[PDB]
Amino acid sequence: ASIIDTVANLAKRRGFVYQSGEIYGGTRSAWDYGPLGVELKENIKRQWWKSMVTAREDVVGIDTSIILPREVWVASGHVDVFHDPLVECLNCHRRHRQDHLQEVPMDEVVCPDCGTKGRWTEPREFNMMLKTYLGPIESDEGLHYLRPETAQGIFTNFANVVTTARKKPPFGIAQTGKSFRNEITPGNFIFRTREFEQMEMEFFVEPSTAKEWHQYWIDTRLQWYVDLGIDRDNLRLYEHPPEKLSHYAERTVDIEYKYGFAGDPWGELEGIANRTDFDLSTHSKHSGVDLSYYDQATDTRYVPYVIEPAAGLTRSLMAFLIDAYSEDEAPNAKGGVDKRTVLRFDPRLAPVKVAVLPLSRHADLSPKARDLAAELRQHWNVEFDDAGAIGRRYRRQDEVGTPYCVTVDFDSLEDNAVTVRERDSMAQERISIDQVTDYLAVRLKGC
Amino acid sequence: AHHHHASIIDTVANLAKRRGFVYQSGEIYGGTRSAWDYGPLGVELKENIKRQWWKSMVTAREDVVGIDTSIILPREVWVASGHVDVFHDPLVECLNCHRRHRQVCPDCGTWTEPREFNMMLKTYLGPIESDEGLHYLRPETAQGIFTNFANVVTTARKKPPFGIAQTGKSFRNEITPGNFIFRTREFEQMEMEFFVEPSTAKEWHQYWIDTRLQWYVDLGIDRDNLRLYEHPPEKLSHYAERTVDIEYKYGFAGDPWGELEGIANRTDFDLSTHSKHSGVDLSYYDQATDTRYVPYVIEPAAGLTRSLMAFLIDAYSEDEKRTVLRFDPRLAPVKVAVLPLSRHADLSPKARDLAAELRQHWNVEFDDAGAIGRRYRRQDEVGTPYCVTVDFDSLEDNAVTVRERDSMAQERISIDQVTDYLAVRLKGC
Ligand SMILES: NCC(=O)NS(=O)(=O)OC[C@H]1O[C@@H](n2cnc3c(N)ncnc32)[C@H](O)[C@@H]1O
Ligand SMILES: NCC(=O)NS(=O)(=O)OC[C@H]1O[C@@H](n2cnc3c(N)ncnc32)[C@H](O)[C@@H]1O
Ligand SMILES: [Mg+2]
Ligand SMILES: [Mg+2]
Ligand SMILES: [Zn+2]
Ligand SMILES: [Zn+2]
């Protein structure tokens, strides 16, 4: 079986993900994140926010609405150009992406729903934004779009943020949140969904420096993934050819990750575009509000250029999950060797930081173990598990990437210490209970 | 006085706009109070409230686990939940300005027959523009939890009594906006469904009412500005047998009180209807007693943006004159401000190095504009708990002055001890 299938099966079995509304018929275009998945996702997001906003003098945060005034998407150009060609099978009348079927221009292709082949309608352009209606009347007055990107909420607040945060280019505005696209086909696993969270930052610079700032952010974003544990050899850069450039972008470089898809194993992870002055210029023109920047140090006025790192939170989750997956040979209690599944997460991403495992269900072990679990829950997400053989419980934690297991044994009742097991090496060290929190805090690398 | 121990909402809203806690969404095209963006300070305050809720509900409790579910679920979910049929309110259209309102027109001064209008927002998925593609944006986050109840029982190995908690965006086609950010069409909720053996539900209901009240108090809200309001039967939602709201004294004109959080006993309504409509059994089998039952549900359902409005209003204060947001340090959006006495080659690099050290842990502001007293007032006004001054003596004793927001008391602390000094006082990161 393929690596992606193996990882997807683990994720489903341990509740990283569940298909949304599965009891009614789920698809891979919409996914829920279970108890382990919601923590992993939140940890990735928190590390992005820390790297982008908390740690940087020159980047501030914002959170804008999914549903903006419709005029925003007229001005941005999305109403006019955010569409893709659809063809309709002449036998089963299902519609498909013409470009995708052409895998470029061909002519007579096969239908992946009935197989008829050759019988297609002429192409029709299909706008990829999702629609809704606000107010009691479902009319054009009430028509709104769910945002296909978070970026326009940032651009429309550029002058507000310059004023309230007292920022001057070069500086950035960063944001996380849900975006929506009427994707015609789902992807492998969670790769391509109609609803997905993005992590986007618009970095406003003086125009003559934009190309240098573009390279800075390409290299900085690449290094962000590596610093959080992704193997650099599973990352690469991809330059958009001119025909693949979005309407707002003069140059775009994708970070791609080696997901392991059948055929071509590489996929887009994050896009880093130079959007020049397109977005502030068009909103200035359409709104009548001046979004240019006045540099008092030179008495000059200019429309900033924009460098945009635009990451996908759920695509990132998929990459971190796949990259952490590993099998190694581990001794078992019997004296033999097992194949052991381990998610080798960076400790800042792992959904459960520590597992508290009494050696057995013995009544004398539970008090100290329960008291210790309660102490650690003040700081971290913790799992308590007393069911079954200790060795099996260690492997249950290894399988979801837990960095440390703490075992309470009968000697603990006399020396008031516990055994701390490290996930990757499986090495154990005996630590006094009153120092366990500090012992873990240093190794978990939190804030 | 707002703490008995121009209205306050206008004053707080003006401050929040001036300092960028909020901006009306799409303002440059015409904003309204039904949609709001959160600026650099607002996004941090919002995230801090959310993270304290998650910590109290999920991280700190053995018996509660988390989930995050899609805004857009299969349409069949909202048929089964009853929302398609009953999530509607009476609308009265004016006969002079033809504007519809929630059943004296506040648009022309002076009426149509009431017509029931469903409050869920619709969207259309897939390539067929027609009602085959019709979906609803979720009006509550709870149905994502109920539809996964059996899934979570299996993978998390939980047994009633236990909860599943979630935060996320919900959508309602509210007809008129509220004061400030009180009632928007798009808002974030923080909801937990607590699943229990039916005979215990009324005791668990009271437990969660008291626990949720205490959560606001522990995070700094004046208990005198919170109260409990029981829904009468006519006001109960279709899924609820009993509902108690926590209300906050927002300070509106007329009646100053408003709903903050709803705590409902949803009995077995939700798991029973999805079991029936889906054909998947969402009952719980108790092996200890060889008994199978549909859990009752107790539901604390908080509003993140309504909570932000309450924490912001409650923190507002004027003393000696000085404007101060008296935030609990865990909620304050900027934890520390670093202030070089003068912007200068000998002090500024030391101040910057300290700001960078602290930004490893906390959101920090560096400010070198204007006199020090002015910079203290700028920080007090947005609730920053501590200000650290780097001055010329710092270059000799390698210590800085640390000012506490509320007392304005100052203490001189060595730089290699400042982080730990601040950590025990900020109580979170
Ligand atoms: N503002 C600039 C921009 O939007 N750029 S981008 O169009 O490239 O989307 C930015 C990122 O969002 C993620 N992403 C995009 N679409 C999807 C989807 N359907 N499912 C999952 N992740 C997605 C993906 O990781 C992508 O790199
Ligand atoms: N699941 C059970 C439930 O939903 N119950 S509830 O209907 O009460 O919504 C839960 C909470 O969401 C918040 N809330 C509700 N509607 C809005 C709105 N339009 N704007 C802002 N906040 C709102 C508010 O704080 C409310 O107490
Ligand atoms: Mg910053
Ligand atoms: Mg928990
Ligand atoms: Zn066909
Ligand atoms: Zn009227």
Residue numbers in the entry:
A (entry chain B): 2 to 104, 118 to 461
B (entry chain A): -19 to -15, 2 to 99, 124 to 130, 134 to 343, 353 to 461
What does the paper say about this structure?
Glycyl tRNA synthetases (GlyRSs) are prospective drug targets for combating Mycobacterium tuberculosis (Mtb) and cancer in humans. Structures of all three forms – complete, or in some cases partial – have now been determined using X-ray diffraction or cryo-EM. Both Mycobacterial and human cells express the α2 subtype, and notably, the GlyRS gene in humans encodes one product that serves both the cytosol and mitochondria, which has obvious advantages for the design of selective inhibitors. Similar to the TtGlyRS, the two Mycobacterial GlyRS subunits adopt the canonical architecture consisting of an N-terminal catalytic domain and a C-terminal anticodon binding domain connected by a β-hairpin insertion. The catalytic core contains the class-II specific antiparallel β-sheet having the characteristic insertion domain after the first strand of the core β-sheet, and the anticodon recognition domain adopts the HGPT fold also found in HisRS, ProRS, and ThrRS.
In the present study, high-resolution crystal structures of MtbGlyRS and MtrGlyRS bound to glycyl-AMS were determined by X-ray diffraction to resolutions of 2.25 and 1.95 Å, respectively. The two groups of synthetases utilize different insertion domains, with the group containing MtrGlyRS having a zinc binding motif. A few of the modelled MtrGlyRS chains are more complete, however, owing to the presence and stability of the zinc binding site. The ATP binding loop orders over the adenine moiety, with conserved Phe205 docking at Arg329, Glu197 and Thr207 at the adenine N6 amine, and Arg195 at the glycyl-sulfamoyl group. This conformational state introduces stabilizing interactions with the YxG loop, including electrostatic contacts between Gly201 and Arg29 and hydrophobic packing between Phe203 and Ile204 and Trp32. The insertion domain also becomes increasingly ordered upon binding AMP and glycyl-AMS, as the lid structure becomes more organized. The two-stranded beta stem forming the base of the zinc motif head places Phe83 at the tRNA A76 binding site, where it packs between His79, Met142, Pro162, and Arg195. On the basis of the structure of tRNA-bound human GlyRS, a major conformational change must occur in this region to allow A76 to insert between and stack face-to-face with Phe83 and Arg195. Interestingly, the theoretical dissociation free energies estimated for the glycyl-AMS-bound states exceed 24 kcal/mol whereas the value for the apoenzyme model having more missing structural elements is less than 1 kcal/mole. AMP orders two tRNA recognition loops and a section of the insertion domain, and glycyl-AMS further stabilizes the structure, including the closure of a lid motif.
